[PDB]
Design a protein around this ligand. Structure first.
Ligand SMILES: Nc1ncnc2c1ncn2[C@@H]1O[C@H](COP(=O)(O)OP(=O)(O)OP(O)(O)=S)[C@@H](O)[C@H]1O
Ligand SMILES: Nc1ncnc2c1ncn2[C@@H]1O[C@H](COP(=O)(O)OP(=O)(O)OP(O)(O)=S)[C@@H](O)[C@H]1O
Ligand SMILES: [Mg+2]
Ligand SMILES: [Mg+2]
Lengths: 187, 419, 419
């Protein structure tokens, strides 16, 4: 049930990121509206600048968390599908790669790592040949519906909001400012 | 009518009004005497009249209602407040009282109040259920209080310099130290105008200790907010009691989730007055100052704070250094690390006459991250890094030269970053 | 209804409970008066009431019982303790006493004690048979007190630097020497967090002298162990009282084989308070400090020891240097070699805003061989040897870079030795 946990955590991250983008857009729109108005709410102007900055940081953090969750669920799906397919076809897979595999079966550490590297780059050119002749690739039914629900790749709105990084000093100062914002909203 | 309506009127309008109505002699009496006479006559006329003021309790529970218009001088114009209503409606010092007032009873020199209908800018039954100021939990200042007017005035540049030198926070505690003849008064007026022009909502209070009269009269005709100033003619006891009155008024106003800003000039003079008034405790430190003498000014200066549920008290005080009397140096040493805001002025900058005479390198604000947005933190950090190694006189010259040609602070930042 | 639990709840709940309990007003006075009124009403209701606190002995057995929630402030909420009970159960200052409390009869206004049911978190009979802190043989620190949080955070980096700068163990006597605005407050924050996270068993208390109220509130709402602070508003007498109360409570706790940790900010302010409160002995040193005036703080700072019988008392007191006041470096000279651990901070590193700003070469500990192991001792030795040449700013930049590259201290050491 770990795959389902990854799936619904990714859905929760998507919902949270969409929500954060929603109030960020709302705050930006209201700030621009106050700029349009002639009335000088300068204190409110600085407050709104603080709000939009901290909510932009929150949106960036939520998008990053969504990216990590999507990568984690994709990795879990790969682990599961590769594991049972390899359990199905392992006899023939090892027959194809008998030398290095039974070398790893009993050898020194460096020789074992060399055998693993040889197996990995052998499968390198195998996969490159397969993708060079270029057939169409599809998922597996249950993982097919799950990963069509979550999508092949995260949305471009999730990646463009995470292209900028924050120094750790900025990280905890923005965390404190977000806590102050939460306290202010509680008031 | 209201007492403040005819108290604030000039002596000429008052003399004409007193002569038109027909009272015999009005020429050789003060504001208070004329006000008392005309109010007594209007009382015996029979019409209903109102009164205004702020309350004070004496050592025996006796209540006096002063008024800030007359610079808090004590006189018979102050309104009678019997213990009956100070106990019934649990009032205390700093409360503003308005409502029905009573003519003085035969044998009483003080006008009384029939009843109160408006206290602390709120209905009386709501004002009773409040929270005490010392029961509130302080906070770091987080609401930015920008000083740049943005109108492109000649003096606005000076204010702009402060917006580049040290931040201003709502509910912040600060000191601006300066030697004599450095421009303290002009900076105070600039701050007051910026407060009245950018943030009209917040309550602005200016307090002046033992200042010579002409700057006082300038203040009453320059600052929109009410100003309380006592000249050096008055004794130090009046100085300390008016300081207590102002701070208590500010605390009571903050109690109602209302922002209050106090401008002090000077904290050193107030400390000297307290040392004069407070009896010696037998432990006289260096400079001829009692150990307990500076305890009260510390409380007054530390009353500034920022509150959880709302309301804040901002105090900006001036301290004198290099005055030739080293007791002032002792006072400044005792007040070295108390303030969040630290601003410095120097004689050498003012000798070259560049204004404002602000020492940029040694002036700054602590915990400034919570005040404003990050990107201008890096902007000001770059500016401070590029201005720090080079000298202070040249620092002010460079700053004024590259700030006058621009329009606003963001324009200055963009101009400096493009170059 | 515990007195402590009602003290913990904020003022609004106190007012609501008072209104629900048929009590009028109780909205425009201090917390102690509200608590006194609530307790009087509950006593008049008739139900039994019990409390707790810390004992204080006056000059004639006129015993008092304070509470750490109110920072040991003298108020109506304090509990009377008669000399009869003191002579009966053999109490002294600093004892933690909890038990039944009594409403006051006519002629007195302070709660008494019906009977005591817990002394120093122990049975009262076993509390009397305890050896004094002065009769316990000191030793060198043995158990290492690791500061590495280990949760893989980013502020823990500072704590990690601590494990690279100066080892801290149970019973250290340490001084944090730092200029103004160098990171003392949040360095103490990190130390307190590490103490409360890695070592939940040891008792942690943070003492703050003449600190601004906002910093006090930030301290209280972050640390886990109980914290006591006195602002600069209060006189130096209260500073001395609070310091003495804290040290006596720590001694009483460590008398029960407990591990007590005290964080002091700052020892310079406490020394100033003692100097301005102790009567002059006629022999004044440079800076205006009396000769014996520094005798009292040293005792407070001299209690840090590792008891052979059991338990330990660690004290980490920070000191201020380069503050522009001669008294500060006079006090620093009088406290230079007294401590066995030193942590030097420099404004030069903080100017470049690289944190933590630690003078690594000057900072260190004394005979750490009894604290740590050997192989990591040579790891630290070679790290010091390779970090000795370059300047402090470059050293800290290199250290933070390498520490950010790795994950834990062991990972840092293995990465350093493999390259
Ligand atoms: N921003 C400014 N623009 C023009 N003139 C200024 C400015 N600031 C100060 N000055 C001049 O500086 C001189 C001193 O101004 P003040 O503020 O009265 O000095 P001060 O700091 O109050 O010191 P005291 O009160 O006389 S001991 C006056 O001639 C002012 O005109
Ligand atoms: N580990 C850290 N991470 C991020 N910022 C830090 C760190 N240490 C210090 N700072 C910054 O450096 C300053 C340290 O402030 P404080 O610790 O409050 O100064 P201080 O040492 O307490 O001296 P005082 O009491 O203010 S005179 C702040 O501007 C912090 O943002
Ligand atoms: Mg002046
Ligand atoms: Mg600090």
């Amino acid at each position: 049930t770990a795959l389902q946990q990854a799936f619904d955590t990714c859905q929760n991250n998507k919902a949270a990121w969409l929500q954060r983008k929603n109030e960020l857009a709302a705050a930006e729109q209201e700030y621009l509206r106050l700029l349009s108005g002639e009335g000088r709410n300068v204190s409110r102007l600085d407050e709104l600048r603080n709000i939009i900055e901290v909510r932009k940081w929150q949106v960036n953090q939520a998008a990053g968390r969504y990216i990590r969750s999507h990568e984690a669920v994709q990795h879990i799906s790969i682990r599961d599908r590769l594991n049972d397919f390899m359990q199905q076809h392992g006899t023939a897979l090892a027959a194809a790669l008998a030398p290095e595999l039974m070398g790893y079966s009993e050898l020194t550490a460096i020789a074992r790592n060399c055998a693993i590297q040889r197996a990995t780059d052998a499968l390198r050119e195998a996969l490159l040949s397969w993708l060079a002749k270029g057939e169409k690739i599809n998922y597996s039914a249950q993982d097919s519906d799950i990963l069509t629900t979550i999508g092949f790749r995260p949305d471009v709105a999730s990646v463009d909001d995470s292209r900028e990084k924050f120094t750790p000093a900025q990280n905890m100062i923005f965390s404190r400012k977000s806590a102050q914002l939460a306290s202010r909203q509680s008031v | 009518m209201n007492l403040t309506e005819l108290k604030n009127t000039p002596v000429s309008e008052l003399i004409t009004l007193g002569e038109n109505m027909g009272l015999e002699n009005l020429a050789r009496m003060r504001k208070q005497d004329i006000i008392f006479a005309i109010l007594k006559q209007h009382a015996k006329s029979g019409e209903d009249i109102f009164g205004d003021g702020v309350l004070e309790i004496l050592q025996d529970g006796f209540g006096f209602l002063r008024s800030a218009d007359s610079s808090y001088l004590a006189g018979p114009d102050d309104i009678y407040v019997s213990p009956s209503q100070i106990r019934r409606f649990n009032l205390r010092t700093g409360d503003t009282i308005s409502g029905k007032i009573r003519p003085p009873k035969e044998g009483e020199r003080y006008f009384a109040l029939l009843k109160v209908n408006e206290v602390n800018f709120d209905k009386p039954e709501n004002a009773r259920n409040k929270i005490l100021f010392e029961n509130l939990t302080p906070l770091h200042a987080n609401s930015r209080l920008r000083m740049e007017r943005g109108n492109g005035s000649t003096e606005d540049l000076t204010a702009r310099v402060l917006d580049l030198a040290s931040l201003i926070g709502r509910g912040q505690r600060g000191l601006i130290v300066a030697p004599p003849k450095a421009g303290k008064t002009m900076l105070l007026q600039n701050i007051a105008q910026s407060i009245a022009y950018n943030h009209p909502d917040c309550v602005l209070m200016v307090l002046l200790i033992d200042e010579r009269p002409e700057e006082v009269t300038e203040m009453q005709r320059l600052v929109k907010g009410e100003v309380v100033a006592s000249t050096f003619d008055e004794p130090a006891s009046r100085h300390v009691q008016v300081a207590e009155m102002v701070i208590e008024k500010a605390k009571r106003l903050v109690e109602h989730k209302k922002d209050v800003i106090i401008l002090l000039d000077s904290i050193t003079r107030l400390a000297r007055a307290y040392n004069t008034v407070v009896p010696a405790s037998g432990k006289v430190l260096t400079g001829g100052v009692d150990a307990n003498a500076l305890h009260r000014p510390k409380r007054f200066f530390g009353a500034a704070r920022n509150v959880e549920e709302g309301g804040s008290l901002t105090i900006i005080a001036t301290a004198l250094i290099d005055t030739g009397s080293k007791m002032d140096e002792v006072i400044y040493e005792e007040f070295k690390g108390t303030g969040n805001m630290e601003l410095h002025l120097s004689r050498k900058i003012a000798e070259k006459r560049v204004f404002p005479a602000i020492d940029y390198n040694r002036s700054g604000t602590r915990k400034e991250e919570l005040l404003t947005t990050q990107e201008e933190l890096q902007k000001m950090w770059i500016l401070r890094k590029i201005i720090h190694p080079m000298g202070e006189i040249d620092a002010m010259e460079f700053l004024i030269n590259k700030l006058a040609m621009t329009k606003t602070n963001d324009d200055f930042f963009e101009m400096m970053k493009r170059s």
